């Protein structure tokens, strides 16, 4: 599973999966 | 499992998985 | 498992896995 | 398991695993 | 297990595992 | 097990394992 | 919870050229 | 919890050229 | 918990050229 | 817990060229 | 717990060239 | 616990060239 | 007699204020 | 007689204020 | 007689203030 | 007679203030 | 008679203040 | 008669203050 | 006598008499 | 006598008499 | 007599008499 | 007599008489 | 007599008489 | 008599008489 959970985000959130 | 949990993020959060 | 848990992050958090 | 736990981070946290 | 636990971090914390 | 525990870190903490 | 926040995020190339002067008196 | 925060994040190349002068009196 | 924070994060190349002068009097 | 923090983080190459002068009087 | 902190972190190459002068009087 | 801290951390190459002078009077 | 002349004469007070910037990205 | 002349004459007070910057990225 | 001349004459007070910078990244 | 001349004459007080910097990365 | 001349004459007080720096990385 | 001359004449008080530095990394 | 004679004047010519 | 004679003047010529 | 004679003046010529 | 004679003046010529 | 004779002046010529 | 004779002057020539 790939899950991103964010609360009160004022910044930058970068999530990446490369095969 | 790949999980990112963030609260009150004002900075930069970079998460990456490369194969 | 790959887990990143962040609270009150004002800095930079870099997490990477390379194969 | 690979786990990163951060609280009140104002600095730089770099975590990497390379094979 | 690979675990990083940080509280009130204003400096730089670098953790790496290379094979 | 590989564990890093830091509290009130203003300096530099470098931990590395190389095989 | 009270939040007063000024936030700026940038992700693109920025080029700026400024010239001030070349006045003859 | 009270937060007053000024936050700036940059991720792109930035080029700046400034010239001030070349005035003849 | 009261937080007053000024935070700056940079991740891109920055080039700056500044020239001030070349005035004839 | 009261926090007053000025934080700066840099991760990119920075080039700066400054010239001040070349004035004729 | 009261914290007043000025923190600077650098991780990139920095080149700085400064010239001041070359004035004729 | 009261903390007043000025902290500087550096990890990158730094080159600095400074020239001051070459003035004719 | 051939004359090609650019001539500028000034006799009055001159005030100049210039602001360039204050851009948020 | 051939004359090619650039001439500038000044006799008055001159005040110049220049601000370049204050950009947030 | 051939004359090529660049001439500058100044007789008044000159005040110049320049600020370049104050950029947050 | 061939004359190529660059001439500068100054007779007034000159004040110059320059600030370059104060950038946070 | 061939003359190539660069001439500078100064007769007034000159004050110059230069500040370069105060950058946080 | 061929003359190539660079001439500088000064007759007034000159004050110069230069500061370069105060950078935190 | 007060006499000002000018030919091909591109500059500034200031003549004054004050008693 | 007060006489000012100028030819091909590109500069500044200031003549003054004060009593 | 007060006489000023100028030819091809590109500079500054200041003549003054004060009593 | 007060006489000023100038030819091809690119510099500064200051002549003054004060009593 | 007070006489100033100048030719091809690129410098500064200061002549003064004070009583 | 007070006489100043200058030719091809690139320097500074200061002549003064004070009583």
Residue numbers in the entry:
A (entry chain W), B (entry chain S), C (entry chain O), D (entry chain K), E (entry chain G), F (entry chain C), ...: 14 to 32
G (entry chain U), H (entry chain Q), I (entry chain M), J (entry chain I), K (entry chain E), L (entry chain A), ...: 13 to 37
What text does the study give?
Islet amyloid polypeptide (IAPP, or amylin) is a 37-residue peptide hormone that is cosecreted with insulin and one of the most amyloid-prone sequences known. Overproduction and aggregation of IAPP leads to amyloid deposition in the islets of Langerhans, a pathological hallmark of type-2 diabetes. Although the precise link between IAPP aggregation and disease remains uncertain, IAPP aggregates have been shown to be toxic in cell-based assays, and genetic and animal studies implicate islet amyloid in the progressive loss of pancreatic β-cell function. Over 40 different proteins, with diverse native structures or in many cases intrinsic disorder, form amyloid associated with human disease, yet all amyloid fibrils share a common cross-β architecture consisting of a continuous intermolecular β-sheet supported by networks of zipper and ladder-like interactions. Amyloid fibrils have a similar cross-β architecture, but fibrils formed by a single protein sequence can have diverse structures, varying with time, self-assembly conditions, and sequence modifications.
Cryo-EM was performed on fibrils assembled from 30 μM IAPP in the same buffer used for kinetic assays (160 mM ammonium acetate, pH 7.4, 1% v/v DMSO), in the absence (4 replicates) or presence (2 replicates each) of 50 μM YX-I-1, canagliflozin, or doxazosin. Fibrils were imaged after 2 weeks, at which point fibril formation was at a steady state, as judged by analyzing aliquots with ThT. Fibrils with a similar morphology were observed for the control (no small molecule) and doxazosin-containing samples, with the majority having a twisted ribbon morphology and crossover distances of 60–100 nm. Following helical reconstruction, multiple distinct IAPP fibril polymorphs were resolved, revealing further detail on the apparent morphological differences between the samples. The majority of fibrils formed in the control (69%) and doxazosin-treated (72%) samples were classified into three related fibril structures (named LL, LLU, and LLUU, respectively), which have a shared structural core consisting of a pair of protofilaments related by a 21-screw symmetry. Each protofilament is formed from a single stack of L-shaped IAPP subunits, with straight β-strand segments encompassing 13ANFLVHSSNNF23 and 25AILSSTNVGSNTY37-NH2, hinging on a turn at Gly24. In addition, further flanking subunits presenting U-shaped IAPP subunit conformations and ambiguous β-strands were observed adhering to these two β-sheets, with the combinations of these flanking subunits differing to generate the three individual polymorphs LL, LLU, and LLUU. Thus, out of the fibril structures that were identified in each data set, YX-I-1 fibrils consisted of 89% C-fold subunits, whereas this subunit fold was absent from fibrils grown in the control or with doxazosin. By contrast, the control and doxazosin-treated samples consisted of L-fold (62% or 72%, respectively), U-fold (34% or 28%), and S-fold (4% or 0%) subunits.
